[PDB]
Design a protein around this nucleic acid. Structure first.
Ligand SMILES: [Mg+2]
Ligand SMILES: [Mg+2]
Ligand SMILES: [Mg+2]
Ligand SMILES: [Mg+2]
Ligand SMILES: [Mg+2]
Ligand SMILES: [Mg+2]
Ligand SMILES: [Mg+2]
Ligand SMILES: [Mg+2]
Ligand SMILES: [Mg+2]
Ligand SMILES: [Mg+2]
Ligand SMILES: [Mg+2]
Ligand SMILES: [Mg+2]
Ligand SMILES: [Mg+2]
Ligand SMILES: [Mg+2]
Ligand SMILES: [Mg+2]
Ligand SMILES: [Mg+2]
Ligand SMILES: [Mg+2]
Ligand SMILES: [Mg+2]
Ligand SMILES: [Mg+2]
Ligand SMILES: [Mg+2]
Ligand SMILES: [Mg+2]
Ligand SMILES: [Mg+2]
Ligand SMILES: [Mg+2]
Ligand SMILES: [Mg+2]
Ligand SMILES: [Mg+2]
Ligand SMILES: [Mg+2]
Ligand SMILES: [Mg+2]
Ligand SMILES: [Mg+2]
Ligand SMILES: [Mg+2]
Ligand SMILES: [Mg+2]
Ligand SMILES: [Mg+2]
Ligand SMILES: [Mg+2]
Ligand SMILES: [Mg+2]
Ligand SMILES: [Mg+2]
Ligand SMILES: [Mg+2]
Ligand SMILES: [Mg+2]
Ligand SMILES: [Mg+2]
Ligand SMILES: [Mg+2]
Ligand SMILES: [Mg+2]
Ligand SMILES: [Mg+2]
Ligand SMILES: [Mg+2]
Ligand SMILES: [Mg+2]
Ligand SMILES: [Mg+2]
Ligand SMILES: [Mg+2]
Ligand SMILES: [Mg+2]
Ligand SMILES: [Mg+2]
Ligand SMILES: [Mg+2]
Ligand SMILES: [Mg+2]
Ligand SMILES: [Mg+2]
Ligand SMILES: [Mg+2]
Ligand SMILES: [Mg+2]
Ligand SMILES: [Mg+2]
Ligand SMILES: [Mg+2]
Ligand SMILES: [Mg+2]
Ligand SMILES: [Mg+2]
Ligand SMILES: [Mg+2]
Ligand SMILES: [Mg+2]
Lengths: 114, 97, 155, 68
RNA sequence: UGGGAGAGGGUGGUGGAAUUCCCGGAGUAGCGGUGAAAUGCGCAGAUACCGGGAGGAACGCCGAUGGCGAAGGCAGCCACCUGGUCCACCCGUGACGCUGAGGCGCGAAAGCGUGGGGAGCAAACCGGAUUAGAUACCCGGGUAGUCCACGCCCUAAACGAUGCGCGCUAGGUCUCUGGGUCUCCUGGGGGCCGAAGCUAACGCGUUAAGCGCGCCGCCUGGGGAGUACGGCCGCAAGGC
């Protein structure tokens, strides 16, 4: 049991994954569009991200989590609705920062990004 | 089934069977050919082969003309194929976005 | 239509309870413009409601209407290359229309021989939360909830 | 609110002027556009190069996480 | 002589972001992917998260309708070596000039040879979809290659589809870069709109496709055909 931790929102166009860690970044629990029951492209809807964030927040609070910092990566649909679901869950959102990785012009991307 | 009208001409059961064998090229697309109807007729410049066919995805209406009657029939088929292949694939075009 | 909205036809109140909703119910029962028959079947059932259950026909009939009103429904829409059952809220006009339609349709599924018996009994059950009518409203609502994930396509 | 107007004289080649150079960086760490710095073409090039040297020395950052 | 701007070129070094992979930790029921899917990956512990390491390639913001080069083409940053170019002074030489058949050099990408390197990507290839079929488009894999050195190849929508040089013929507006006296003026670039004029039209118009002089290259109906034969070049592909 730890009361302070982190919430990562990995949110792509296909899915949204929420992992709740401790102060050091070690995962406590996690959820996703698949864990809340969806398959296929439904996992990339905002309601999907919503259920996933709530199911992740619920599990975390079951271990005494009360405060989280929120780290957000990716520009997926359910990104903004996932932040909502965390706030409106019971957890205390101490902060929200976007840590989306961006190359400083690095590796050549797959054909579909050119 | 399939009906064949020979307007102001006379044709044999052999020619009617040729038309049915040529219309069978449309069976390729594996869609329902619903009451296909071929009209054969002669202008002063050659023969005219008309056709009206409904399918689950629309209607086919085409007209072929040529001196040689079997060629007018073939021109009819060519126009009917391009119409059917359009009906069967046009909806695929805008899957994205 | 394309140019403008359509204006909802106002119905004259019926002559036994002064109700406009009771009128719309009669019309939904009416086949081939036999309104005399249509009214007689409803009222004949309003006696059966009274005689099998000692309370107000009007009240029983109206509660069964609220018990069939679907609050949400699915409305199809092709998105790219897939037909999606979009969950949608139902306008009160349409709620009423769906309620009355399903009542009669479900009543006429019944096994009871005389129609006014089928109209009475279905309105009796639906007043309590039973019958194939209320089932149809529940079924439609469960469809809408099942597809809440598509609720952002709503127009 | 253009950054150059918020500063007196400075040397556009002082790669160690951490406290002046840092104003020409967005809160996310990026080099700010000419529209938000108020420099001409010629001096924006000197600024960009100087910021880059200062980055390599560790004075200025290459990127910062965006905090809502 | 005194100045300037610049992704101009060559060599050695060097920085951070990101991807992938390997190790450690924490954690579990899916992840991924699409129009929707499936193949694929995952309880032999994947994805998502944190820490450490390895390695290659490309340099986000700045960055622009921008800059530089003869063209190809050139973009993190530092140093060295080095080319072109513009400006002010009007100091030196005294027509020393223009063009240029041949020649010589340069010449994107792909390709070739020898050696190295290989993260990502990805011809060929394999598999999943799509579809009437789908030797494709989309998806999951994947070898050459993409990268470096040296040597070849010598092509292109190598384009402004517009050879180079000079002189001449309204202006207006935006911009890069110099010199003034900094209002503005004046050089050199880069765009837009337009005087006269040109043009079959579209359009061009002091960055001419205008008006003229010089010199070079090239066209002479479509196909056959950039093919055949010859010759020259190339390791080959194939080029002229
Ligand atoms: Mg998905
Ligand atoms: Mg017949
Ligand atoms: Mg006949
Ligand atoms: Mg006709
Ligand atoms: Mg054919
Ligand atoms: Mg009805
Ligand atoms: Mg029903
Ligand atoms: Mg029930
Ligand atoms: Mg000098
Ligand atoms: Mg591990
Ligand atoms: Mg085990
Ligand atoms: Mg890591
Ligand atoms: Mg850019
Ligand atoms: Mg330019
Ligand atoms: Mg130039
Ligand atoms: Mg002199
Ligand atoms: Mg002299
Ligand atoms: Mg020359
Ligand atoms: Mg020559
Ligand atoms: Mg070459
Ligand atoms: Mg190459
Ligand atoms: Mg190559
Ligand atoms: Mg080979
Ligand atoms: Mg080889
Ligand atoms: Mg090689
Ligand atoms: Mg060999
Ligand atoms: Mg090799
Ligand atoms: Mg490999
Ligand atoms: Mg295949
Ligand atoms: Mg197949
Ligand atoms: Mg086959
Ligand atoms: Mg394939
Ligand atoms: Mg592929
Ligand atoms: Mg791949
Ligand atoms: Mg090979
Ligand atoms: Mg090889
Ligand atoms: Mg040549
Ligand atoms: Mg061009
Ligand atoms: Mg040019
Ligand atoms: Mg040419
Ligand atoms: Mg031509
Ligand atoms: Mg020439
Ligand atoms: Mg000429
Ligand atoms: Mg000027
Ligand atoms: Mg000045
Ligand atoms: Mg000019
Ligand atoms: Mg113009
Ligand atoms: Mg004129
Ligand atoms: Mg002329
Ligand atoms: Mg001008
Ligand atoms: Mg003039
Ligand atoms: Mg010019
Ligand atoms: Mg011309
Ligand atoms: Mg010829
Ligand atoms: Mg040849
Ligand atoms: Mg050739
Ligand atoms: Mg030969």
């Amino acid at each position: 049991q730890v009361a302070s931790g982190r919430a990562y929102i990995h949110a792509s166009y296909n899915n949204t994954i929420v992992t709740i860690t401790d102060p050091d970044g070690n995962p406590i629990t996690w959820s996703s569009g698949g864990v809340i029951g969806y398959k296929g492209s439904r996992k990339g809807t905002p309601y999907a991200a919503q259920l996933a964030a709530l199911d992740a927040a619920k599990k975390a609070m079951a271990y005494g989590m009360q405060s989280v910092d929120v780290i957000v990566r990716g520009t997926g649909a359910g990104r903004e609705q996932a932040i909502r679901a965390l706030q409106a869950s019971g957890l205390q959102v101490k902060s929200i920062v976007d840590d989306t990785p961006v190359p400083h012009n690095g590796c050549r991307p797959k054909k579909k990004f050119r | 089934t399939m009906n064949i009208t020979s307007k102001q001409m006379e044709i044999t059961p052999a020619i009617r069977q040729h038309v049915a064998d040529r219309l069978a090229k449309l069976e390729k697309w594996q869609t329902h050919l619903i009451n296909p109807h071929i009209i054969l007729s002669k202008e002063p410049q050659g023969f005219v082969a008309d056709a009206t066919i409904n399918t689950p995805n629309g209607v086919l209406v085409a007209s072929g003309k040529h001196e040689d009657m079997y060629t007018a029939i073939n021109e009819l088929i060519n126009k009917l194929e391009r119409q059917l292949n359009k009906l069967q694939h046009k909806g695929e075009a805008r899957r994205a976005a | 239509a394309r140019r403008r909205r359509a204006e909802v036809r106002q119905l004259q109140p019926d002559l036994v309870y002064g109700d406009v909703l009771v009128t719309a119910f009669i019309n939904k029962i009416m086949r081939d413009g036999k309104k005399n028959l249509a009214a007689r079947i409803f009222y004949d059932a309003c006696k059966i409601i009274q005689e099998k259950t000692g309370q107000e026909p009007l009240k029983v009939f109206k509660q069964a209407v609220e018990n069939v009103k679907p609050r949400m429904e699915v409305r199809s829409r092709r998105v790219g290359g897939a037909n999606y059952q979009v969950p949608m809220e139902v306008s009160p006009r349409r709620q009423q229309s769906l309620a009355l339609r399903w009542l009669v349709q479900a009543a006429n599924q019944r096994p009871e021989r005389r129609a006014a018996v089928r109209i009475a009994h279905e309105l009796m059950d639906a007043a309590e939360g039973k019958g194939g009518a209320v089932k149809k409203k529940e079924d439609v609502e469960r469809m809408a909830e099942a597809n809440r994930a598509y609720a952002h396509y709503r127009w | 609110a253009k950054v150059k107007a918020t500063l007196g004289e400075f040397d556009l080649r002082d790669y160690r002027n951490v406290e002046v150079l840092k104003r020409f960086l967005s809160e996310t760490g990026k080099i700010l556009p000419r529209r938000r710095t108020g420099l001409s073409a010629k001096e924006q090039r000197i600024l960009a190069k100087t910021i880059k040297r200062a980055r390599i020395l560790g004075l200025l950052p290459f990127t910062e996480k965006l905090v809502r």
